[PDB]
Design a binder for this molecule. Structure first.
Ligand SMILES: [Mg+2]
Lengths: 224, 94, 48, 48, 97, 97, 226
């Protein structure tokens, strides 16, 4: 029973590959499957939960003077990666006002203290001459994935609830393969692939997941 | 699939001519102990043992990799066959 | 068979590196009844 | 010799489904009933 | 269920669930919001498409295997379930290009 | 099942997910208690099955039961054979069979 | 809002069976905890099994004993069901002795008692002997992990010893239920109940603690990257 070797290969803040081998027979899927469930359900992140646009009644309306439809604008907002620098910050409202002939990017949101926009070049909407965009978007701290028709957040009337993609983890794929040390051939080799949006780093994401699991193991203490 | 096999079929007029060039090249390497190679130390194919990394013993793997570089010349009637053998045994002994 | 030590298996692994073997199954009706494969050593008596 | 079942030995039922044992999974990988009982054999439905 | 809302033919699932990119669609499936055989609205490579998350996943399998996303999108017939013939065509078409 | 109901356990979360998939298949009748639907599947010879690797259910009810299976006389120990070099025939000098 | 540490309930019945509840847990964590523990519980939990047998006047497994109804193959098959608990954690090997005669049905009790070893199933049938039937044997019982087949260990106490198949693992069955629950603010939370059956050399609770400990120890390996 040796000490497994742990190996990391990273490409910046959105991707890393993590290989742990050798493990005893069966343990490749015993760690990977629980870690994968955690990496998807429990990693804390931020998401656009609600949006108000001035002259827009509902989600399926079209905006005069703006090329994208309302759905398309919400879609782009689902993309936006916002990073809360303040450990205590549980929510923020971001404001944007612009008009005339300009293609509106992420940078245009009015800067807020302790709110970092990671992807400032992200396109939001193209505005033609005399097209007008005035909007407030609500950004909350959370985990996992909550469809809009289920969290139901409205700050005011006409505010549209947005499907909330909290998880900084975009995908987790893991592959187990047979491997041998000397005479023992039935051993496991675990390869983990983690994709994030850049707010949480892939190595960071794993460590948080591993930490959560250890804590859950402690729940096997004071009985009844 | 053999790595870069499609590019190798590109280099020849007949797929069987590729096999001959590769096969003959691997024989050149084995007889001379690899020291006539056109590859450089980091391009050398490696083999992972229990001890650690060593040179790939398989000369046929080598020959295809060498071919891909572009440093080999193949054709018919390039040099009298016997004379080639002496010049190679002179440059890279046995 | 009892005189075979475990270092001999590592010795064989070095030998077969990069080489291929031929698989054939009868009847050999067309040219694909034989194909080449690079072998992966396994415990056990079966061909995979 | 006492022969334990192994990979490559051949099994069949009385209706003509016949096949060779290709994999032996540890009990923790075997599909199981809600009450915890694991199954013994997994037969592919494509044979029926 | 197939329906006509505003004369065009769509389904309830296409309206309820509209996903910005593929990664999100499979994240919804991972959380049991939709299954892979559910028709849903997904935005992939500049187009707003009506397909299942499964058909998006299949196109990605093809896409990552050949490490060419543009060519991969061309070969597949996405609007149909993959069966013996389409997959056979895919192998041939992938072989040529 | 009755053992379970008396032992102080109710229907599982995953058994519901499979039952959801089963009513889309027309296997169980919509609008019955989980026990009523599970028995409907059990009369079709199908049960809920958990994958030991994931823990998640198989997305559908699976046929499970007792079958009589025999071990036949063809065993690899008898059939595996290989030769480097060996005995030759008298006239032809080719390897034996 | 973030859920807080759940109540852990324990309903053990004897040394054989236990039910282990954890409530309330975040949605989907029922199986996230439940499945890896089951895998570790069925495989990596140490235990005891018979590894070798020497029967007097017996050279190998295919013999047969005058006066005994059962053949040696069946005798070793019965000794493979023997569950032997080591009270002292430092004791890795013993040797049980049995001497029987006359018209008796030898059960597991008749083994001569040894200190710090308790036979958890003293009613198990071993051999049926008839008037004039005799029997003197030495069974070597060991502590180990997993399943080690006779060809693998080849354990022989003397020249005529018969190697035996070892099922070390004390865990006979593991199931786990995931049921719906709420903290009254939030819904679709998970209530996890682990059912653990054992042979008695180790206890359902002891297993669960060892399983969790293995899993904990495994997560440590992620510390030092490269
Ligand atoms: Mg929607």
């Amino acid at each position: 029973l040796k000490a497994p070797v742990f190996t990391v290969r990273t490409q910046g803040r959105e991707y890393g590959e993590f290989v742990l081998e050798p493990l005893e027979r069966g343990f490749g899927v015993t760690l990977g499957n629980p870690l994968r469930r955690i990496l998807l359900s429990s990693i804390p992140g931020t998401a656009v939960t609600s949006v108000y646009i001035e002259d827009v009644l509902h989600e399926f309306s079209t905006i005069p003077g703006v090329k994208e439809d309302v759905v398309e604008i919400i879609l782009n907002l689902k993309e936006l990666v916002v990073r809360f620098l303040n450990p205590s910050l549980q929510t923020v409202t971001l404001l944007l006002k612009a008009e005339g002939p300009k293609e509106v990017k992420a940078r245009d949101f009015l800067p807020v203290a302790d709110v970092e926009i990671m992807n400032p070049d992200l396109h939001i909407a193209t505005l033609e001459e005399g097209g007008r965009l005035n909007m407030e978007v609500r950004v909350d701290r959370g985990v996992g994935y909550v469809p809009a028709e289920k969290h139901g957040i409205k700050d005011r009337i006409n505010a549209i609830p947005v499907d909330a993609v909290f998880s900084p983890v975009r995908r987790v794929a893991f592959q187990v393969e047979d491997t041998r040390l000397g005479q023992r051939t039935d051993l496991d080799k675990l390869t983990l692939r983690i994709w994030t949006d850049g707010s949480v780093t892939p190595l960071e994401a794993l460590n948080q997941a591993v930490e959560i699991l250890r804590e859950h193991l402690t729940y096997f203490s004071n009985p009844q | 699939a053999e790595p870069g096999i499609d590019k190798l079929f590109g280099m020849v007029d007949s797929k069987y001519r590729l096999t001959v060039v590769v096969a003959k090249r691997a024989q050149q390497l084995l007889r001379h102990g690899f020291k006539n190679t056109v590859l450089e130390p980091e391009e050398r194919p490696k083999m992972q043992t229990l001890e650690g990394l060593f040179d790939d013993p398989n000369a046929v793997t080598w020959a295809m990799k060498e071919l891909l570089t572009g440093r080999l010349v193949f054709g018919e009637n390039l040099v009298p066959e016997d004379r080639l053998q002496k010049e190679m045994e002179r440059l890279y002994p046995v | 068979q009892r005189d075979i030590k475990d270092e001999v298996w590592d010795a064989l692994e070095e030998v077969i590196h990069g080489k291929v073997v031929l698989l054939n199954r009868a009847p050999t009706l067309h040219r694909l009844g034989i194909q080449a494969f690079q072998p992966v050593l396994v415990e056990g008596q079966s061909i995979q | 010799q006492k022969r334990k079942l192994q990979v490559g030995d051949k099994l069949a039922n009385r209706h003509g489904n016949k096949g060779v044992v290709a994999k032996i999974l540890p009990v923790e990988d075997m599909p199981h009933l809600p009450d915890g009982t694991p199954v013994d054999v997994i037969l592919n439905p494509l044979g029926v | 269920a197939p329906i006509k809302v505003a004369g065009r033919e769509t389904s309830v699932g296409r309206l309820k669930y509209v996903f910005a990119n593929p990664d999100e669609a499979l994240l919804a499936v991972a959380h049991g919001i939709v299954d892979l055989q559910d028709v849903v609205t997904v935005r992939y490579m500049g187009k707003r498409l009506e397909t299942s998350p499964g058909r998006i996943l299949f196109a990605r399998i093809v896409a990552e295997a050949v490490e060419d996303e543009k060519v991969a999108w061309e070969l597949i017939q996405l609007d149909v379930p993959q069966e013996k013939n389409s997959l056979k065509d895919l192998v041939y078409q992938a072989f040529l290009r | 099942f009755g053992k379970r109901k008396g032992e102080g356990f109710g229907v599982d979360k995953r058994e519901v997910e499979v039952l959801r998939r089963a009513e889309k298949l027309g296997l169980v009748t919509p609008g019955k208690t989980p026990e009523e639907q599970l028995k409907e599947l059990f009369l079709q010879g199908k049960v809920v099955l958990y994958d030991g690797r994931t823990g998640e259910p198989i997305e559908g009810p699976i046929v499970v039961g007792q079958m009589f299976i025999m071990k036949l006389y063809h065993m690899v120990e008898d059939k595996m054979h290989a030769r480097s070099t060996g005995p030759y025939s008298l006239i032809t000098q080719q390897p034996l069979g």
